Amino acid sequence: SIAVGMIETRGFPAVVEAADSMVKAARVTLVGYEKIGSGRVTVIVRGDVSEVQASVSAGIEAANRVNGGEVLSTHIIARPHENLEYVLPILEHHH
Amino acid sequence: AVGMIETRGFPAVVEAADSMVKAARVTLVGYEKIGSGRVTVIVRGDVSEVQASVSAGIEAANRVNGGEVLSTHIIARPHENLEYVLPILEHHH
Amino acid sequence: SIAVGMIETRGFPAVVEAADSMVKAARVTLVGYEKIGSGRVTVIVRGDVSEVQASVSAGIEAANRVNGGEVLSTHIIARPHENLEYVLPILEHHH
Amino acid sequence: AVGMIETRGFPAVVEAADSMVKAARVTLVGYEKIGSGRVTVIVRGDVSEVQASVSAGIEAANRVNGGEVLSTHIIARPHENLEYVLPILEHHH
Amino acid sequence: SIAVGMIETRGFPAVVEAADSMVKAARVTLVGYEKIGSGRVTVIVRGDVSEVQASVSAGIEAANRVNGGEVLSTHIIARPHENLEYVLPILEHHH
Amino acid sequence: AVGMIETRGFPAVVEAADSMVKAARVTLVGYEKIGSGRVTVIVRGDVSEVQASVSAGIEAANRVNGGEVLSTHIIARPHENLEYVLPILEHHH
């Protein structure tokens, strides 16, 4: 199935590293970037579930190594419900 | 009825929303950000469906790595004045 | 006199419950919703002063019972000065 | 002159503004949000009126349930360069 | 040389006093006002370096005397690189 | 390559940016605000230039009165997908 994978960091450089490592690690596309305040930012990828699993693992490993990198929360959703797309910005850049 | 789950953190709120819409016959109608990392998702449906959905959404958001549920509430017959002031029904048509 | 009543909560679900309970408790209209950050949100009602007093009391009681509900500050202003309307968003939805 | 009261919390800032405009001959000209729950209201008038207004506004905002006054200041003859950079005079016409 | 001078405060009244005292103290113009959250606000002046030094010293002294005034950070840059102007809002009101 | 310095505080981020562009052949291409007083500046250039620039920017931002460097990172060959999702290259033409 298609899945989305999410890494939320405290800090911008770490979220950029999470995104870069995710898209380089597996066949996924970066589709979202969400800011919710308090320094919390999330990047969202989409692809086949196994690919998303590989990408999220790579992104966590990489973001942890950033100078001042802080990973706050991570999650994968297989088969996200279609209602989510038009309410939550998880798929903003998916076409 | 309207059901609301507020989390600290975005991944947890997404999981709350996904689990809510998959658990019962409810529509996700709102997403509100108020700072301090606090985000709320809002669903609408028959009260029994909303009750089922919110329970499922809490259970799922609690299991998210770094998931933090902050507040949850169900309102059965929300007053019509709320619709056009508060973004609880943004995507209800 | 006409008054405005305000309940500020930390958290969105509690502010929605405050608003709902306020408009159901008395002859008031919900006229404002203000976000100032740090999780602080305020709802504002308008009506005859005695009605606003009843509504604010009901809203506090209800918002306190919300799971994770936190009431931060509450206040009633009788006869708000007309200068306030066009500077502060207390009466946004009053027509 | 310009007089400013900054509070933590919205209800308290509204009460500061109301009490200021009712206490003396000043006009409420600004409302500024800067995060951390900090909000400022700004009035303009003759300096003696502004002084009276700010004193009344502090006394009233202190009495608000959960009211928190954070900072207050009066500037008598603010430099004209400030007008078009800082939102101290947004509603002054 | 032309320089920019910056005073960042926690709180709005103190930043207004910093700006006023800066423009009154020396031959500088107020050219920027930046908000970055958490109550942190910065005002930016421009002028000859010696004038900017005098202005920043005056602004610090004044902002420290504000009731609830908190100066967080201050800095002067002589000859700011031209790349900065169109990325960072340090010179928004310089014409 | 892309180089990033994130500070707590605006004056420090400006000094990081100025020192970076003056230290080597890099262009300042981004400025991102994410709350909690955290701001990041982003430069682009050949990796060796970026390395020189980030080192200079850290050293300078550390010396700012009330300067606080929070996080720094260099990415050598950022993936093209990042460009149109993240504001790392806003001013790169």
Side-chain angles (χ1 to χ4, degrees), chain A, chain B residues 1-88 90-93, chain C, chain D residues 1-88 90-93, chain E, chain F residues 1-88 90-93:
Chain A
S1 300
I2 297 151
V4 290
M6 297 174 284
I7 298 176
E8 180 181 49
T9 62
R10 177 110 53 205
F12 185 71
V15 97
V16 181
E17 179 52 41
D20 192 56
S21 285
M22 277 198 292
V23 293
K24 281 174 174 174
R27 189 62 154 265
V28 303
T29 66
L30 173 72
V31 293
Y33 165 52
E34 178 67 346
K35 304 156 83 174
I36 68 170
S38 175
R40 300 181 77 109
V41 282
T42 300
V43 287
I44 303 98
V45 299
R46 178 189 184 277
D48 286 357
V49 66
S50 67
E51 296 296 291
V52 173
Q53 294 166 329
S55 286
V56 172
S57 296
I60 292 165
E61 299 192 302
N64 281 337
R65 291 168 184 185
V66 169
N67 290 332
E70 193 187 354
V71 174
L72 295 179
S73 72
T74 67
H75 194 57
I76 296 172
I77 302 176
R79 300 169 297 283
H81 196 288
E82 64 179 348
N83 194 166
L84 272 49
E85 302 165 9
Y86 67 85
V87 180
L88 291 161
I90 55 164
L91 286 155
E92 185 181 350
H93 300 285
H94 175 247
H95 314 284
Chain B
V2 49
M4 293 175 284
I5 299 177
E6 181 182 45
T7 64
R8 184 104 58 197
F10 186 70
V13 97
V14 181
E15 177 52 43
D18 191 61
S19 289
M20 283 198 288
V21 291
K22 281 178 176 173
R25 190 175 275 275
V26 304
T27 179
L28 176 66
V29 293
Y31 165 53
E32 178 67 337
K33 305 155 72 167
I34 65 164
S36 188
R38 305 180 74 112
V39 281
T40 301
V41 285
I42 305 103
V43 301
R44 175 196 185 275
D46 284 1
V47 70
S48 59
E49 296 295 272
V50 173
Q51 293 167 336
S53 280
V54 168
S55 293
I58 293 166
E59 289 171 14
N62 281 335
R63 282 173 195 181
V64 168
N65 290 338
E68 184 181 12
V69 178
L70 297 177
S71 69
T72 65
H73 190 60
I74 297 168
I75 301 175
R77 298 164 299 283
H79 193 291
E80 61 174 356
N81 192 166
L82 272 53
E83 305 169 356
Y84 67 85
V85 180
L86 294 165
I88 54 164
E90 182 183 351
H91 302 282
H92 169 65
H93 300 104
Chain C
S1 300
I2 297 151
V4 290
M6 297 174 284
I7 298 176
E8 180 181 49
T9 62
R10 177 110 53 205
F12 185 71
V15 97
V16 181
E17 179 52 41
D20 192 56
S21 285
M22 277 198 292
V23 293
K24 281 174 174 174
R27 189 62 154 265
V28 303
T29 66
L30 173 72
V31 293
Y33 165 52
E34 178 67 346
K35 304 156 83 174
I36 68 170
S38 175
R40 300 181 77 109
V41 282
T42 300
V43 287
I44 303 98
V45 299
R46 178 189 184 277
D48 286 357
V49 66
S50 67
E51 296 296 291
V52 173
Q53 294 166 329
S55 286
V56 172
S57 296
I60 292 165
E61 299 192 302
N64 281 337
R65 291 168 184 185
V66 169
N67 290 332
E70 193 187 354
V71 174
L72 295 179
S73 72
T74 67
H75 194 57
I76 296 172
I77 302 176
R79 300 169 297 283
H81 196 288
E82 64 179 348
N83 194 166
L84 271 49
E85 302 165 9
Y86 67 85
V87 180
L88 291 161
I90 55 164
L91 286 155
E92 185 181 350
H93 300 285
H94 175 247
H95 314 284
Chain D
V2 49
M4 293 175 284
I5 299 177
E6 181 182 45
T7 64
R8 184 104 58 197
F10 186 70
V13 97
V14 181
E15 177 52 43
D18 191 61
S19 289
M20 283 198 288
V21 291
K22 281 178 176 173
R25 190 175 275 275
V26 304
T27 179
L28 176 66
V29 293
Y31 165 53
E32 178 67 337
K33 305 155 72 167
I34 65 164
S36 188
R38 305 180 74 112
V39 281
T40 301
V41 285
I42 305 103
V43 301
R44 175 196 185 275
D46 284 1
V47 70
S48 59
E49 296 295 272
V50 173
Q51 293 167 336
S53 280
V54 168
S55 293
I58 293 166
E59 289 171 14
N62 281 335
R63 282 173 195 181
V64 168
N65 290 338
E68 184 181 12
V69 178
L70 297 177
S71 69
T72 65
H73 190 60
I74 297 168
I75 301 175
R77 298 164 299 283
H79 193 291
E80 61 174 356
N81 192 166
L82 272 53
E83 305 169 356
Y84 67 85
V85 180
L86 294 165
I88 54 164
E90 182 183 351
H91 302 282
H92 169 65
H93 300 104
Chain E
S1 300
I2 297 151
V4 290
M6 297 174 284
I7 298 176
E8 180 181 49
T9 62
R10 177 110 53 205
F12 185 71
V15 97
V16 181
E17 179 52 41
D20 192 56
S21 285
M22 277 198 292
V23 293
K24 281 174 174 174
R27 189 62 154 265
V28 303
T29 66
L30 173 72
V31 293
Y33 165 52
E34 178 67 346
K35 304 156 83 174
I36 68 170
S38 175
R40 300 181 77 109
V41 282
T42 300
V43 287
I44 303 98
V45 299
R46 178 189 184 277
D48 286 358
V49 66
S50 67
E51 296 296 291
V52 173
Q53 294 166 329
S55 286
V56 172
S57 296
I60 292 165
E61 299 192 302
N64 281 337
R65 291 168 184 185
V66 169
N67 290 332
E70 193 187 354
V71 174
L72 295 179
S73 72
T74 67
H75 194 57
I76 296 172
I77 302 176
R79 300 169 297 283
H81 196 288
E82 64 179 348
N83 194 166
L84 272 49
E85 302 165 9
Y86 67 85
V87 180
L88 291 161
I90 55 164
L91 286 155
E92 185 181 350
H93 300 285
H94 175 247
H95 314 284
Chain F
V2 49
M4 293 175 284
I5 299 177
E6 181 182 45
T7 64
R8 184 104 58 197
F10 186 70
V13 97
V14 181
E15 177 52 43
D18 191 61
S19 289
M20 283 198 288
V21 291
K22 281 178 176 173
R25 190 175 275 275
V26 304
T27 179
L28 176 66
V29 293
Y31 165 53
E32 178 67 337
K33 305 155 72 167
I34 65 164
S36 188
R38 305 180 74 112
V39 281
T40 301
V41 285
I42 305 103
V43 301
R44 175 196 185 275
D46 284 1
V47 70
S48 59
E49 296 295 272
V50 173
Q51 293 167 336
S53 280
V54 168
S55 293
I58 293 166
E59 289 171 14
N62 281 335
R63 282 173 195 181
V64 168
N65 290 338
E68 184 181 12
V69 178
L70 297 177
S71 69
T72 65
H73 190 60
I74 297 168
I75 301 175
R77 298 164 299 283
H79 193 291
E80 61 174 356
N81 192 165
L82 272 53
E83 305 169 356
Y84 67 85
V85 180
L86 294 165
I88 54 164
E90 182 183 351
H91 302 282
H92 169 65
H93 300 104

